[PDB]
Amino acid sequence: SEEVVIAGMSGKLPESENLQEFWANLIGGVDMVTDDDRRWKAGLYGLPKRSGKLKDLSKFDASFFGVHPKQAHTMDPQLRLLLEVSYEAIVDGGINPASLRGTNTGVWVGVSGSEASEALSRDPETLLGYSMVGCQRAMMANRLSFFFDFKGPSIALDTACSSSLLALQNAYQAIRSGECPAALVGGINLLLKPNTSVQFMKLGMLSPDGTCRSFDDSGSGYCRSEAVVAVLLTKKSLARRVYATILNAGTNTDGSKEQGVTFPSGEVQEQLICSLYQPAGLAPESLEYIEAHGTGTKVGDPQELNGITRSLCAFRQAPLLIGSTKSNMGHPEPASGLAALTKVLLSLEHGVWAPNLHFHNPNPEIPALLDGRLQVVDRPLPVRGGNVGINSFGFGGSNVHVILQPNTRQAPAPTAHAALPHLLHASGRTLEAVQDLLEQGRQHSQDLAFVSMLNDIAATPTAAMPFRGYTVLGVEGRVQEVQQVSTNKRPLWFICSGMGTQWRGMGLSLMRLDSFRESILRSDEAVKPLGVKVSDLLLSTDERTFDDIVHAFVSLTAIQIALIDLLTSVGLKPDGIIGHSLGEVACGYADGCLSQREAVLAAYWRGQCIKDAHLPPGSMAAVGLSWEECKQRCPAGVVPACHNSEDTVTISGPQAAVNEFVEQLKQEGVFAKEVRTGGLAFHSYFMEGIAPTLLQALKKVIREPRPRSARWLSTSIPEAQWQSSLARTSSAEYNVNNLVSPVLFQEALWHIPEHAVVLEIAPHALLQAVLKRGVKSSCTIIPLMKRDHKDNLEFFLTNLGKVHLTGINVNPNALFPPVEFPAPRGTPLISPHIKWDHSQTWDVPVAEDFPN
Amino acid sequence: SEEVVIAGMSGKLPESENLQEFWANLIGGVDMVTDDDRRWKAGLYGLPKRSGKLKDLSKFDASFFGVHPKQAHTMDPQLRLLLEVSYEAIVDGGINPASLRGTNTGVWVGVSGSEASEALSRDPETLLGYSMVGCQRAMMANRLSFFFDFKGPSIALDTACSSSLLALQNAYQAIRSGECPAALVGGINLLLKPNTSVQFMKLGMLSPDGTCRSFDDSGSGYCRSEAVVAVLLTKKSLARRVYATILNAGTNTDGSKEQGVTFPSGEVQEQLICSLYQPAGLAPESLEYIEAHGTGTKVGDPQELNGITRSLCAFRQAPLLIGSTKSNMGHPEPASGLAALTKVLLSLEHGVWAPNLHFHNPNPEIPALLDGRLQVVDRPLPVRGGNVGINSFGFGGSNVHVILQPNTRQAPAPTAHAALPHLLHASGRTLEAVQDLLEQGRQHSQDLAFVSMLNDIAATPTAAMPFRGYTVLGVEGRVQEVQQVSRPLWFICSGMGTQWRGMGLSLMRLDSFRESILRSDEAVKPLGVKVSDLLLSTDERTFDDIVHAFVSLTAIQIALIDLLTSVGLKPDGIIGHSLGEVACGYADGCLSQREAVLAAYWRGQCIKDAHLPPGSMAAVGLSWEECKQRCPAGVVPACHNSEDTVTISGPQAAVNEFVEQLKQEGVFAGGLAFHSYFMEGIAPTLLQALKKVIREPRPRSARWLSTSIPEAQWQSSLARTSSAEYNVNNLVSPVLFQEALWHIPEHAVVLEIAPHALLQAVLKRGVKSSCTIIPLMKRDHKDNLEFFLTNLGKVHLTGINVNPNALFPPVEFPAPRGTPLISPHIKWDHSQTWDVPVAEDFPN
């Protein structure tokens, strides 16, 4: 008792480079069996000219999989292709492979041949030991387990034609029982060695026409085909996409039979099917369609379909639809079951059954074809609803049957939170890969499940996926950016900005996000008793509301908090924090020293204690000279107040010297403008008359001071006394000290390391210009809001995408209400849009590499 | 929740044609790795000269397995050997494979190579399609499922070196969960293609010295070896033998590793082990011994043993014994786990751990070897008791661990009545096969569990096993007979003249016989007599009384029929001589035991009450026809025994004097004259008593041929049932015996059911020479239990199955530990010689 779902799929089939191409051929009625000379001179040794073949075996993004070129040239192309296809299958489910690393996830691979092994070991003189590691059959599973870090069972298995569906069944049992949370299941077959086809020809199993005429009177054997298919199974609770739910599955074996080991026993096949329906409480009446093995042999077709008649049709009012993918693409031997499973799920996802080919006259030995109890799908029929069965029977008697319940979940009805703009990330091996995924997102921008899944798979280690991109969906522009990434560790720095960042109706754009709004309404609970509401202050576009120092300090800090809350919701944890002036309050919230209440109220009283105080009329001007040069050329009573950069220093004093010894600068052509402080001289001795009343209110607010982490660098206290006990905590004392001490900003920026990402946390990104000058060129400086930007939600999103571009992972899904998985039916496939770096070309065995 | 046991095993190992030879080499410290040119010129391509190799690959009893010679020459020798070894493994468990036919028994085979496939498909012109059916890897399992008719899962699997122990673990899970009642589990590896060794050499996995120096500082890689091993798993309730109980088992995979895919992760191996002990309520303290993978590589040995140290030694007071079969015989790759499992179970069964070879200086990177937390078994150590662990780790990271609880029934399995002599059957492909099994029985004659198991496996269809044999155990003789077989079964119930003093006192030792006699007592206790008292009495005239004789003969004839039935013998034809026709009715299903015993009573009591004149009978040597003429008056032909022998009946007033007019011319020759006129005065009073006894007459089957009623009136309504009327008619009518024997077909087996086999001489003359006539008791034979047994063996010799185990109290399985192995004594017809791929069949 644990629910098992088919979550993701991918594959390569005859004439079909991915499952989109496979579908196109299926529903299009294209015969994928061909007669060219791809593997060997068609007709050689009197073999059928027709076989189902893959378009290509020579491509493999070796460096992504950690495989050096010498090892790649000696890998079974089965395995090279299965690595890609496996990755494609996992992400198709909307699951980041990283989230399964180290889990007890299993791998089962159905595989019957190792022809590359034979070829690559033919010459003792020149063969490589690596050939074993890349060709021994166990490695078809073990190398997958090695790459993905799956620590559950890792098993290669052969039951001939039933191998891959057996593999599925084994995986299903492992998940059901609780052994495994998930399973990668594979099926592979290649036609490299002609001698192999000769063996089957001499047994009389191959049709001369190279065609599986499933169910037709003129069936005379099967068509050999290739396939590489992979499917991700998970338990229901882990799944995002859900193609179908596995209701039951089992295997039996024909046993002893008078007629020989390769004569299939319809009677035992019947026993298997019977044992999985009524005994498990599942009615044959619930089936809509059964995918038969259907190899088109004189003997097997009647054994199978008659067994189906006795086990299923006999317990039914309605005709049972029946098909076989082998009619479309031939028989890929152990991969038959997964190949067929692919057709079934593709059919279900598009709402229409892909038809059989080659069905002209029913086999007269099969009563149910003649009386309509079985109805062959020879035209595209719509999917009316119901369960689906699948048979795979190996030529040594090993039988498998699985029962699927299709996922029929419909999409939600759209709501107001769906209409907001959304952010979409991608990563990739090539810029094409990223563009292709972003394009696919633009096109299905309203499918919210699809966008969630694509964001989840975008958070990938940067050495693996060196191109990244983002797009903002649901906005007038075409907002998109894509670039190559530095393999560097990129550390994350929060910068909380000070005064001068206020504006009319700031953050009203971001109240559409629930996490932002809830942070503002929580900031309201702190300052309601004191007669003010931050939401009312934001809403008010009375244009002088933020001239009041209390209105500004409280609103800036409450927003800085809401942004921090967003950044956190999205998974951004800072490596360093730095505050400028009033920013040191928000910094405390970011660091874990201050609760939201403590920070908002520290902002209130910091402003209210200035409002109530008689300080002498003072003013500040930024001036164009160094910190050191400001010591000398200042008069008395004017002091260096903010060390912004080595060019820009704010000074503070009374007008009694500030205006007149600003002109002794600006007559010598030096930069210098007054700043709108609301009439005060901050970060100077002049504020020291606030200390007693502020220190009292803040001791009633910051109950028990908590330590400041190493991550938080003070700008109030110079580096030499970071060890001091004033510095140790964010106390009432630290805060008061900030307000009277200078702002030692460039001093903290000297400590930001190479290749860092720096986020300016503030309702307008005032300090961008300073940060660029003040921190290393190798760093990337990112704003988060602009003043009077038409849409700040868009601006925030675009910049949050810019963080994804650096290499740092970001989950924008958390900004919006959670999507209810399982995803609805018909959510677009992801596997076909996964693009690899296929610039290299690897060796492939040829017919001449085998004996003759 | 379902208990899983290892029930049976067999195999072929380097230098070891069966597990007896393997054990001999193990405990004897023989290095089974060799350097001859068996597979390829030793040294070729710079390969090690040493590899572990099987003695032979060319033998396969093809016709037993239904394989035509063209298919056999193109079978992977892996599969040919695994078919034999699998059969050997199933019967080693004391299980007749027939009893698993049609069950949902599973097959899992660990296998990594199909070098025969490459060889046999090298030439398109001349290759056979059969090569696929005999070499594709799925067939290593599917052909087993096909031969044994196992309808559970049939899976061939590859995880490289861990494949066979993985296979065991998969089978274990299937039985545990209820999917399968039993599982055949296999492991196979051959060294046919040199190129394969070259690949391993270039990876740096093979030691140049061709030696697995498990745990030793001088380890430099592994020795490639061959093996073909098979083990039968069952749920506890099906098992006869129980080597061990699987307490837990699991697999994990190393996953990602900086050092590469073939660097083993001790840390992940440790995680596997940890997950199977404390979490399942099993203490590392309970382990006695751990069978390490132990391939003797610079890297792997420390990873493994250190992982063992952290997961197990750390939770222990005592040192943990450790070994590796690879030191003894090299590394047989996917078959490593089952090969090692074999050593462990053999050690447990002989009470001593086979030591490692090649262990001289501990690897210094393995702290626990230096501080004694791990103790390598480098000398034979006694088995002190405790659980056993087994590691098998494949070179691609796939790890398996199993925990075993050895069977601790040391004492024999409880039963009644062990001191009695016992009967042992065997069947075989050759006379050697039969002799070998019988010899093994003589030698362990007191091991009752062993004898039960060997009898169970002896019931095999005669076309499959054309030689048969038996031996009687626990008797002064050397009673043993063996022959080839090409047969319908006839019961003959005999009449009067078979009585004797203390008859059937020998057979009262058998519970089924005694219970039949005590049930015959319940019928005639109300009438004042006890059959058991009459038998016990060796007052030597007790059976002169007609009631005492009739009741005792018939009660015994019934007890014998009961024995024959308990043993599985159902008759194809039945024939009675005179009073025998009562017993015949019981055998046919017409008469209950009560009805038959009481019909015997009143038949005798009604004659006793009529008080008749002295009459007598003599068998004479002249035909039925000749008896009409040369008889006087008052003497008549009474019993047509053969065309030479006819019994006559009359008064002595002519019988003695007109017997001498014969026996002066050299002619062959309870006081009454039966089957004549003299008895016709009993008809009314007997017919009345028998109508009170046979309530509702039941029909006589076609199988029962009348001797009272001639063939022309078998259709009659007197003949239709065993009525009061049929019985009375028998007593007055002649006995048309030769007339019924004419109907016994060619090649029939004929059992004379009677307390003395009086009619043997007649039956030989009277039925075809092609038939086999068997007695069951003799008069005053020293031991009739012995005599019965010997003759019951003679029936097994004919081709007809017989389960003598039912004659004795049931053996309580599981069998005790140390019950001898059966697998090594199964011998095949290896007169043929099949092709084997050679080095020259592969590219160079």
Angle at Cα A621 formed by Cα A617 and Cα A622, nearest 5°? 155
Residue A524 CB neighbours (<10 A): 17
Q: Nearest chain B residue to A254 by CA: give it.
A: B151
Angle between helices A514-527 and A596-611 (to 10 degrees): 50
Length of chain B: 844
Q: Which of B764, B758, B714 is nearest to B736 (CA)?
A: B714
A609 classed as catalytic:
no
Residue pointed to by tokens 């193609």: A243
Of the partner residues B127, B141, B256, the one whose CB lies closest to the CB of residue A195: B127
Q: Which of B304, B187, B255, B292 is nearest to A153 (CA)?
A: B255
| Cα separation, B766 vs A63, whole angstroms | 92
Residue pointed to by tokens 């070897």: B369
Q: Which of A156, A166, A107, A154 is nearest to A136 (CA)?
A: A156
| Cα separation, A556 vs A584, whole angstroms | 12
In the structure encoding, which two tokens stand for residue A497, read together?
A: 């900005």
Label residues B159-168 b or e (16+ Cβ within 10 Å = b).
Answer: bbbbbbbbbb
Q: Are A110 and A90 in contact (CB under 8 A)?
A: no
Single-letter amino acid, residue B318: A
Q: How far is CA B269 from CA A657, B367, B514, in A?
A: 78, 18, 62
Residues of B with Cβ-Cβ distance to A398 under 8 angstroms:
138, 141-142, 145, 153-155
Query: Cβ contacts of residue A131 below 8 Å, gap of 6+?
Result: A74, A117, A120, A121, B199
Q: Three-state SS for B696?
A: coil
Largest CA distance in chain A: 116
| Cα separation, A469 vs A481, whole angstroms | 6
In the structure encoding, which two tokens stand for residue A294, read together?
A: 């259907």
The structure was resolved experimentally with: X-ray
Is A683-742 CATH 3.30.390.30? no
Q: Which of A751, A743, A740 is nearest to A680 (CA)?
A: A740
| Cα separation, B238 vs B104, whole angstroms | 14
A293 classed as catalytic:
yes
Smallest Cα distance from A814 to chain B, Å? 30
Which is it for the CA torsion B48, B54, B60, B66, positive or negative? negative
| Cα separation, B784 vs B776, whole angstroms | 8
- Which residues precede gaps in chain B, with C-N > 2.5 A? 486, 669
| Cα separation, A509 vs B780, whole angstroms | 117
Q: Which of B709, B699, B707 is nearest to B741 (CA)?
A: B707
Residue A822 CB neighbours (<10 A): 18
| Cα separation, B56 vs B59, whole angstroms | 7
**Interchain CB distance below 8 Å, B159 and A156:** yes
Label residues A58-80 b or e (16+ Cβ within 10 Å = b).
Answer: ebbbbebbebeeebbbbbbbbbb
Rounded to the nearest 5°, which phi and psi values hold at B213?
-85, 65
Q: Which of A313, A306, A301 is nearest to A277 (CA)?
A: A313
Q: Nearest chain A residue to B201 by CA: give it.
A: A129
| Cα separation, A520 vs A559, whole angstroms | 7
**Mutation for A interface: B65, B142, B173, most A CBs within 10 A:** B142
| H/E run at residue B564 | helix B546-566
A425 classed as catalytic:
no
Instruction: For B4-16, give the DSSP string.
Output: EEEEEEEEEBTTB
Angle at Cα A113 formed by Cα A109 and Cα A117, nearest 5°? 110
| Cα separation, B468 vs B485, whole angstroms | 7
| Cα separation, A64 vs B247, whole angstroms | 42
Query: Cβ contacts of residue A710 below 8 Å, gap of 6+?
Result: none
| Cα separation, B448 vs B452, whole angstroms | 6
Rounded to the nearest 5°, which phi and psi values hold at A679?
90, 20
Q: Which of A663, A664, A643, A662 is nearest to A653 (CA)?
A: A662
Q: Three-state SS for A304?
A: helix
Q: Which of B573, B538, B674, B541 is nearest to B619 (CA)?
A: B674
Q: How far is CA B125 from CA B76, B193, B277, B835, in A?
A: 20, 22, 57, 19
Residues of A with Cβ-Cβ distance to B203 under 8 angstroms:
129-130, 132-133
User: Regarding the domain delimited by B1-414+812-844, which CATH topology (the fold level of the hierarchy) does it fall under?
Assistant: Peroxisomal Thiolase; Chain A, domain 1 (3.40.47)
In the structure encoding, which two tokens stand for residue B607, read together?
A: 């004659």
Q: Number of H helices and number of E strands within chain A?
A: 29, 28
Single-letter amino acid, residue A401: H
| Cα separation, A665 vs A650, whole angstroms | 13
| Cα separation, A423 vs A425, whole angstroms | 7
| Cα separation, A461 vs A147, whole angstroms | 14
Of the residues A145, A162, A509, A581, only one is catalytic, namely A581
C-alpha dihedral (A841, A846, A849, A851), degrees to nearest 10: 170
| H/E run at residue A782 | strand A780-782
Of the residues B135, B161, B180, B493, only one is catalytic, namely B161
Q: Are B304 and B399 in contact (CB under 8 A)?
A: no
CATH node for A617-682: 3.30.70.250
Q: Are A769 and A720 in contact (CB under 8 A)?
A: no
Smallest Cα distance from B641 to chain A, Å? 48
Q: Are B788 and B507 in contact (CB under 8 A)?
A: yes
Query: So what CATH class is B614-674?
Result: alpha beta
Residues of A with Cβ-Cβ distance to B139 under 8 angstroms:
261, 396
Q: Nearest chain B residue to A74 by CA: give it.
A: B199
- Could you list the beta-strand ranges (E) of B684-757: 704-705, 735-736, 749-753
Residues of B with Cβ-Cβ distance to A252 under 8 angstroms:
104, 151-153
Q: Which CATH superfamily is domain A1-414+820-852 in?
A: Thiolase/Chalcone synthase (3.40.47.10)
Instruction: For A230-243, give the DSSP string.
Output: EEEEEEGGG-SS-S
Smallest Cα distance from B287 to chain A, Å? 25
Residue A713 CB neighbours (<10 A): 22
| Cα separation, B401 vs A140, whole angstroms | 22
Angle between helices A163-176 and A336-350 (to 10 degrees): 70
Instruction: For A36-72, give the DSSP string.
Output: SSSSS-TTGGG--S-EE--S-SS---GGGGT--HHHH
Q: Are A496 and A589 in contact (CB under 8 A)?
A: no
| Cα separation, A436 vs B543, whole angstroms | 108
Q: How far is CA A417 from CA A688, A819, B626, in A?
A: 49, 11, 121
Residue pointed to by tokens 């660029």: A772
CATH node for B675-734: 1.10.287.1960
- Could you list the beta-strand ranges (E) of A394-466: 398-406, 422-428
Residue pointed to by tokens 């899904």: A813
Query: Cβ contacts of residue B34 below 8 Å, gap of 6+?
Result: B14, B15, B50, B51, B52, B53
Q: Is A229 left (phi over 0), alpha (psi -120 to 50) or beta?
A: beta
Smallest Cα distance from A283 to chain B, Å? 22
Instruction: Verify cis geometry, omega within 30 degrees of 0, for the bond prior to B837.
Output: no
Rounded to the nearest 5°, which phi and psi values hold at B491?
-90, 130
| H/E run at residue A494 | strand A492-496
Query: Cβ contacts of residue B446 below 8 Å, gap of 6+?
Result: B418
Report which DSSP code applies to A206.
Answer: B
Residues of A with Cβ-Cβ distance to B148 under 8 angstroms:
255-256
A789 classed as catalytic:
no
Instruction: Verify cis geometry, omega within 30 degrees of 0, for the bond prior to B632.
Output: no
Single-letter amino acid, residue A816: F
| Cα separation, A409 vs A267, whole angstroms | 37
Of the partner residues A122, A127, A160, the one whose CB lies closest to the CB of residue B136: A160
- The resolution in Å comes to 2.7
Q: How far is CA B439 from CA A654, B346, B825, in A?
A: 122, 21, 10
Rg of the Cα atoms in chain A: 35
Query: Cβ contacts of residue B503 below 8 Å, gap of 6+?
Result: B535, B543, B552, B556, B755, B756, B777, B779
Q: Three-state SS for A760?
A: strand
Q: Are A355 and A29 in contact (CB under 8 A)?
A: yes
Q: Nearest chain A residue to B250 by CA: give it.
A: A153
Residues of A with Cβ-Cβ distance to B123 under 8 angstroms:
195, 851-852
Task: Could you list the residues of A known to form a binding site for an acyl-CoA, using ranges.
Answer: 647-648, 671, 773
Smallest Cα distance from B485 to chain A, Å? 25
Report which DSSP code applies to A417.
Answer: T
Largest CA distance in chain B: 115
Label residues B78-115 b or e (16+ Cβ within 10 Å = b).
Answer: bbbbbbbbbbbbbbbbbbbbeebeebbbbbbbbbbbbb
Instruction: For A105-132, give the DSSP string.
Output: -EEEEEE---HHHHHHTS-TTT--THHH
Q: In what order do the strands lie in the sheet with A780-782?
A: A712-713, A576-579, A492-496, A757-761, A780-782
Q: Are B638 and B708 in contact (CB under 8 A)?
A: no
| Cα separation, A211 vs A35, whole angstroms | 11
Single-letter amino acid, residue A524: D
Q: How far is CA A776 from CA A488, A818, B570, in A?
A: 15, 39, 102
Instruction: For A624-674, give the DSSP string.
Output: ES-HHHHHHH--SS-EEEEE-SSSEEEEEEEHHHHTHHHHHHHTTT--EEE
Query: Cβ contacts of residue A593 below 8 Å, gap of 6+?
Result: A705, A706, A707, A708, A712, A729, A730
Is B487-613+735-780 CATH 3.40.366.10? yes
Of the partner residues A149, A251, A268, the one whose CB lies closest to the CB of residue B153: A251
Label residues B42-68 b or e (16+ Cβ within 10 Å = b).
Answer: bebbebbbbbbbbeebebbbbebbebe
| Cα separation, B66 vs A256, whole angstroms | 11
Of the partner residues A124, A141, A148, the one whose CB lies closest to the CB of residue B198: A124
Of the residues A135, A161, A630, A779, only one is catalytic, namely A161
Q: Are A422 and A472 in contact (CB under 8 A)?
A: yes
Smallest Cα distance from A199 to chain B, Å? 4
In the structure encoding, which two tokens stand for residue B600, read together?
A: 């015997």
Query: Cβ contacts of residue B206 below 8 Å, gap of 6+?
Result: B47, B48, B197, B200, B221, B222, B223, B224
| Cα separation, A598 vs A106, whole angstroms | 50
User: Regarding the domain delimited by A488-616+743-788, which CATH topology (the fold level of the hierarchy) does it fall under?
Assistant: Malonyl-Coenzyme A Acyl Carrier Protein; domain 2 (3.40.366)
Q: Are A53 and A81 in contact (CB under 8 A)?
A: no
Residues of B with Cβ-Cβ distance to A401 under 8 angstroms:
none
For chain A, the 3-state helix, strand and coil shares in percent, each to the nearest 5, are 40, 20, 45
Per domain, the residue ranges of chain A are 1-414+820-852, 415-487+789-819, 488-616+743-788, 617-682, 683-742
Q: Are A235 and A3 in contact (CB under 8 A)?
A: yes
In the structure encoding, which two tokens stand for residue B491, read together?
A: 């019961």
| Cα separation, B774 vs B791, whole angstroms | 6
**Interchain CB distance below 8 Å, A145 and B45:** no
Of the residues B73, B293, B401, B422, only one is catalytic, namely B293
Q: Nearest chain B residue to A153 by CA: give it.
A: B252
Residues of B with Cβ-Cβ distance to A156 under 8 angstroms:
157-159
Of the partner residues B101, B200, B256, the one whose CB lies closest to the CB of residue A146: B256
Of the partner residues A154, A158, A204, the one whose CB lies closest to the CB of residue B398: A154
**Interchain CB distance below 8 Å, A158 and B136:** yes
Which residues sit opposite B480 in a β-bridge? B471
| H/E run at residue B260 | none
Q: Classify burial at B380, counting beta carbons within 10 Å of its beta carbon; exposed 0-12, middle 13-18, buried 19 or more.
A: middle
Q: Which of B112, B166, B113 is nearest to B341 (CA)?
A: B166
**Interchain CB distance below 8 Å, B844 and A124:** yes
Of the residues B117, B445, B578, B642, only one is catalytic, namely B578
**Interchain CB distance below 8 Å, B154 and A396:** yes
Q: Nearest chain B residue to A260 by CA: give it.
A: B146
Q: How far is CA A101 from CA A62, A297, A821, B638, in A?
A: 20, 44, 22, 97
